[PDB]
């Protein structure tokens, strides 16, 4: 058998910033 | 037998900004 | 057999922003 | 067998924008 | 057999906007 | 068998900024 | 006393 | 006492 | 006293 | 007393 | 006292 | 005086695909 | 004197989806 | 005096689709 | 005076995809 | 008294 | 005087994913 | 007087990937 | 013979 | 011949 | 022939 | 024969 | 003949 | 016979 387990306790924060660009 | 299994305690806060750009 | 199995307990605030392109 | 299965006991506040593009 | 279940116990505010292109 | 186990108990913060560039 | 067996849903008891 | 055998649903006892 | 037998579902005693 | 057997899901005892 | 057996879940007890 | 001027001449194609998430 | 001038002379194509989300 | 001019010449397609939410 | 000038004339392809997070 | 036989998952008794 | 000029004469072509994460 | 000019004469493709995280 | 003066719409002649 | 003077608007000539 | 003075907008002749 | 004098927009003569 | 005074903007002829 | 004077923006002559 086959077995995946993801466990969070704890607070995430992401920030993602894609772009600003110029042509 | 296969087993996915997640499992989420805490806060997560996620900001994703795409854009700003000229052209 | 196969088990798909997702458990959140926390809460998620998600923000998303796409635009503000100038041609 | 197969079993899927989605239990959420948070509150989730989600915002999306998307637009202000001039031309 | 095959089982679908999805279980929501919490609240859920969501925001959508869609639009302010000047052409 | 095979058991993939992953476990979070930490708080993580990641920034990610993609852009600025001018052509 | 509380026995569930072949739980696929959500269980709350208070 | 609450007994649930083959629970697909969603039970709440309070 | 709580007894849990093939658990694949959420589960909350309070 | 909390006993649980084949557990897959998540238990939440309080 | 908590007894776990196969424990592949998250198992929380306060 | 102050002059915003913007004069786009080529096709745009632009798709967004926001959702998909399982909690 | 301020002056905001948009003009545009070629074809816009825009899809959006927002959705698609199991709770 | 202030001059706010938006000119659009070309064929404009939008497709927007908000929903398909199961809770 | 203060002159903002933006000229495009070529053609413009963006996909954008955000979403897919299990929880 | 905590027993964990074969645990795979993540326990946590405060 | 201040002037910002922006030509862009070429195509552009950009893809952004944000996502797939299990938690 | 000051002078920002930007000149884009050349095929431009950006790919760009945030994600893929198990927590 | 085409003669624009302060032009800040779109003029196009064919 | 076209001439335009403070042209605001779009005008189309063919 | 074509003479454009002071010309914010898009000017197309063809 | 194409003059522009102080030209802010896109001008496209074909 | 192609005469261009304080070109601030995109000219293109052909 | 192209001249320029003060070209801060692009030129393109085909």
Same mark, same amino acid.
């Given at each position: 058998?086959?077995?995946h %387990? %993801? &466990?969070?306790? !704890?607070?995430?924060? %992401? %920030? +993602?910033n894609? !772009?600003? &660009? +110029?042509?």
């Amino acid at each position: 058998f086959l077995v995946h %387990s %993801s &466990n969070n306790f !704890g607070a995430i924060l %992401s %920030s +993602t910033n894609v !772009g600003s &660009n +110029t042509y």
